[PDB]
Amino acid sequence: YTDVPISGMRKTIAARLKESVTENPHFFVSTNLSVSKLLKLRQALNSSADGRYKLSVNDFLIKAMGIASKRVPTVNSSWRDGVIRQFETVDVSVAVATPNGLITPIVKGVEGKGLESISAAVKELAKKARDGKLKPEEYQGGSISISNMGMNPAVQSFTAIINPPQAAILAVGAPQKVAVPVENEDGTTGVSWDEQIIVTASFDHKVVDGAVGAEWIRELKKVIENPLELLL
């Protein structure tokens, strides 16, 4: 009936996603991260401030992605002319939802940067993405991506398409209350309510195998569920 035409900008993104799904054989690895200690650490770090900063879960996730990509360097790679290009630093592309679609500004040098610097760079790039004032060197590049959907409480889990020429992409669902067993100080078991987040990582099988993706997911889960390991 109504036949509004394609903008032309959508055609390049459609061809790019076509390239991604036709040259990257994707496989997904799902996990559930417990963030009950991460939320307490974020609450303490936000309460011990004078309005200098404001921390979110995405800052801890980007720092944990940097730590996990430094520990497993096979995921921090690409696919080039007969050659695998392996980087040292973790450059994390963060997806920002604008009314003109999707853009991925890059936070450069994630490992050894600082949570306040990460929060400042994410806020700068997000407000500049909403104003539409970016340079091509700010959204062209990166070694790993992350898609965030925590503001929507309906999305329990979702998958994402890998932006070429990267090798992996993360997808973070809304937190939910999951029943987790607990021992009391006597012999019986109990019911405790834990805040869990379903995290799905999509890997390219030409670069990352299933054991390498499982090791990356295990290190990410370790750094998330033990928040004091973000110091190291």
Author numbering: 227 to 458
Q: What wording appears in the published article?
A:
The pyruvate dehydrogenase complex (PDC) catalyzes the further formation of acetyl-coenzyme A (acetyl-CoA) from pyruvate, enabling the tricarboxylic acid cycle that sustains oxidative phosphorylation. The PDC is a multienzyme complex consisting of three components: E1, E2, and E3. E2 then covalently links this acetyl group to CoA through its catalytic domain. Without exception, the PDC is organized by non-covalent recruitment of E1 and E3 to a large core built from E2 catalytic domains.
We therefore carried out separate recombinant expression of N. crassa E2 core-forming domain (tE2) and His-tagged PX variants, which could be co-purified by Ni-NTA affinity following brief incubation. The C-terminal domain of PX however appears to bind to the icosahedral assembly of fungal E2. To confirm that this binding localizes to the E2 interior, we collected single-particle cryo-EM data of a reconstituted tE2 + PX recombinant subcomplex. The reconstruction shows an interior density that under icosahedral symmetry (i.e., when over-symmetrized) appears identical to that observed in the endogenous preparations. The overall resolution is better, likely due to the absence of the PDC exterior. However, we are not able to find a tetrahedral class of particles in this or any recombinant preparation, which we attribute to a decreased occupancy and order of the interior assembly compared to the endogenous preparation. The increased resolution of the E2 region may also dominate alignment and increase implicit symmetrization, further de-emphasizing the interior component and obscure the sub-symmetric interior. The appearance of the over-symmetrized interior nonetheless unambiguously shows that the interior density observed in the native PDC reconstruction can be accounted for by the C-terminal domain of PX, namely the core binding domain (CBD). We also observe fast incorporation of PX30 into the PDC core during subcomplex reconstitution, further supporting a model in which PX oligomerization and binding are mutually enhancing.
